[PDB]
Design a protein around this ligand. Structure first.
Ligand SMILES: CC(=O)N[C@@H]1[C@@H](O)[C@H](O[C@@H]2O[C@H](CO)[C@@H](O)[C@H](O)[C@@H]2O)[C@@H](CO)O[C@H]1O
Ligand SMILES: CC(=O)N[C@@H]1[C@@H](O)[C@H](O[C@@H]2O[C@H](CO)[C@@H](O)[C@H](O)[C@@H]2O)[C@@H](CO)O[C@H]1O
Lengths: 413, 415
């Protein structure tokens, strides 16, 4: 029931390939992905290339995306499209009509927002007749523009961020009705007290909860490369995200997971990949696992943080790397041969402060009491899920999720 | 040499975003309509982030599209000046992702950004060097607007750093295309804004010719009026002002931008204004050329431009000649038919912008300033003034080399 895919980083040109779109290079990339057994790709337009002026959405760029989508479908790959990039791999791609003389908050300016909505509706409507089109993700961790540590953020309130998300997803739904439209925020949404994108936003707006699991976020540094916390980090984000859902079986999509050097050294990447995926597949209701990323980044492109270059499952010339070989069996076995995991009946209480804005959510970050209690329960074999403090004695909430035992971080010690 | 006539080329289909949907036949039709008006050159604009999307990727296809544009121009008798670092165009900043936010690195001082800019300019120049109609490079369109107030987020630099950067950029242009016409082109803050890092000395002493961009929405029309002498003579003023800082007595001054922006120049007055402006400029000797901004109106289906930008063309979106396009063409035809002799300017107004080479009091040259108003009064009186720096006001060798026999101060004119 969990699907298996990759975040597609075009080997020739990286995301700048939209400026030199080569369908045969894309076909060869997708062939090398399909050969490892994946069933979907997550793909990335570059927003200022597609919408260089607020009222110019380039039809040729839309046609190229459709051709990419059709090429993926010929190779047995479904396609999720991320709209607003926005941020990719340390670089911000911002249209000139949003910056300096035209600086206008990405989340609140009425004209920017209507321009974003028309962009997203246009992409979704163009792919709506593709059977392998899964739906849209609003944008790749667009929440990284909304506050620190961004050097120049478009600060917003949680109320403002939620309003914006609902408008963006309405546009996706109007473009492609009935498809799988979601938003996907990086882990500040679960770990930073002040951050305006909240756990509630992730679990209650959009079709599924998307989480992006990256052990350079303090996890590998604090607990160690070969620790239980590092191996279980993706499973933790999946079970943590469930605490805020209103539907007891709302799917959680592990939409990014990668093996970043030096926190996961190259010679440990395959072992880490297998352990991380084994752990997350012991979590019920996982929509899918989508590895970051398909192909190493061309070192002929300068100024990436070193870690970005070697995140591929395939080399830049499409050779299978050790983690690619590894995943291409923690997929064949995970598919077909791995039973859906049993329910997790022990829930750890998550006290994130009252209201829906999670002002104390850093207890969930690496080093926090909720994080460490979850990892302790995990090491003990308890297979924990999570429950909000507000629901810790809510018998209807617990029964709907099959939770029979509730423990606080203090109980765990 | 005699003055040249040309246009700043705004592609009618796609504007400068046409690099993303490059249509050579649309460029050819655009240039056809420009050649019909009798021009002899175009100034053309790469979009820097499209040409160099990563510091170490200068896209071969963008370079080849620029060469194809240059060839289409040469066929039509249009020589080509290429501006490199845009950078700024018509109120929009086009900055590569590798210069901003997480990668914010000063455009003028960061070692890696500056090396990237030099390789980009060298690459463009080398790729066009075999084209006989390639004039040379301009470093970038008013790149000085990134360097301080009123930019909302400037990359600050000292004047010494600005001059060093310019020399490095121009050396790269020269390595790419030896012997061609390489210059830099700064907007009027270089002449008008106290403490602005790009100075009059930089414009008149670095690069092959001095480039001035004349825009009467800079306070000139607002203070003196649309139909005033100051508004009609503003471009000739910048030409003669820029001469004060030249070391060579016959260094050409290129009026590389001049346009008719509404409502400071209403559309119904644009033709009369263009005629008056060009007549005033062509009464100035050693004008390299007049380059009108711009060839084509901007498509109003493109959002968020300041209103004035859309109707700056001499030609409409569908390539029809506008009243100002007819007026400029007639001025060009008149000059080419009569080839009037240049007339020297023997009366010089003293320009005192303070001590040193950084012009700390240059605002006397701005609209409302004592030098500005004295120049316009001498002009109205028919004295045909040039300008001379205070440090040269009694330099007999400097004055004889320019044929200046009369030197007057702003207060002299006050009387
Ligand atoms: C500025 C910076 O590098 N921020 C990073 C994000 O880029 C990163 O986003 C995801 O992680 C991969 C690997 O780093 C990156 O290539 C993609 O942008 C992807 O969307 C984020 C992950 O939590 O971590 C930030 O620190
Ligand atoms: C932010 C802003 O509008 N800055 C303008 C410059 O754009 C302008 O540059 C020149 O003027 C024309 C007409 O405005 C414009 O299309 C081009 O960018 C051109 O290079 C400059 C002129 O001095 O004035 C600034 O205020």
């Amino acid at each position: 029931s969990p699907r298996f895919g990759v975040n597609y980083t075009p080997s020739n040109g990286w995301f700048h390939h939209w400026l030199d779109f080569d369908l045969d290079a894309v076909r060869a990339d997708l062939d090398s992905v399909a050969a490892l057994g994946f069933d979907h790709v997550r793909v990335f337009p570059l927003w200022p290339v597609f919408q260089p002026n607020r009222t110019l959405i380039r039809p040729r760029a839309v046609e190229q995306l459709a051709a990419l989508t059709d090429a993926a479908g010929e190779r047995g790959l479904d396609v999720n499209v991320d709209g607003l990039q926005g941020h990719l791999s340390s670089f911000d791609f911002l249209p000139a009509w949003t910056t300096t003389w035209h600086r206008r908050n990405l989340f609140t300016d009425p004209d920017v927002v209507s321009g974003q909505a028309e962009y997203l509706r246009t992409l979704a409507a163009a792919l709506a007749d593709r059977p392998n089109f899964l739906g849209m993700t609003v944008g790749n961790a667009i929440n990284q523009f909304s506050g620190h540590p961004h050097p120049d953020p478009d600060r917003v309130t949680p109320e403002q961020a939620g309003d914006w998300l609902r408008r963006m997803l309405d546009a996706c739904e109007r473009g492609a009705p009935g498809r799988l439209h979601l938003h996907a925020e990086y882990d500040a949404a679960w770990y930073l007290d002040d951050h305006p994108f909240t756990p509630a936003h992730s679990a209650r707006i959009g079709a599924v909860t998307a989480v992006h699991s990256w052990v350079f976020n303090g996890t590998a540094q604090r607990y160690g490369t070969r620790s239980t916390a590092t191996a279980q980090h993706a499973a933790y984000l999946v079970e943590l995200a469930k605490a805020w859902a209103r539907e007891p079986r709302r799917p959680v999509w592990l939409q990014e997971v990668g093996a970043p050097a030096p926190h996961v050294p190259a010679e440990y990447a395959a072992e880490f990949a297998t352990a991380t995926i084994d752990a997350v597949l012991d979590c019920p209701e996982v929509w899918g696992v989508t590895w970051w990323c398909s192909h190493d980044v061309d070192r002929r492109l300068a100024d990436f943080p070193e870690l970005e270059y070697s995140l591929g499952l395939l080399t830049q010339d499409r050779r299978v790397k050790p983690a690619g070989r590894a995943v291409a069996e923690a997929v064949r076995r995970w598919r077909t041969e791995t039973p859906a995991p049993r329910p997790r009946t022990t829930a750890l209480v998550v006290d994130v402060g009252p209201g829906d804005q999670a002002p104390a959510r850093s207890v969930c970050a690496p080093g926090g009491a909720v994080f460490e209690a979850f990892m302790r329960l995990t090491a003990q074999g308890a297979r924990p899920t999570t429950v909000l403090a507000e629901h810790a004695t809510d018998a209807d909430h617990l029964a709907a999720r099959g939770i029979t035992e509730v423990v606080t971080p203090h109980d765990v010690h």
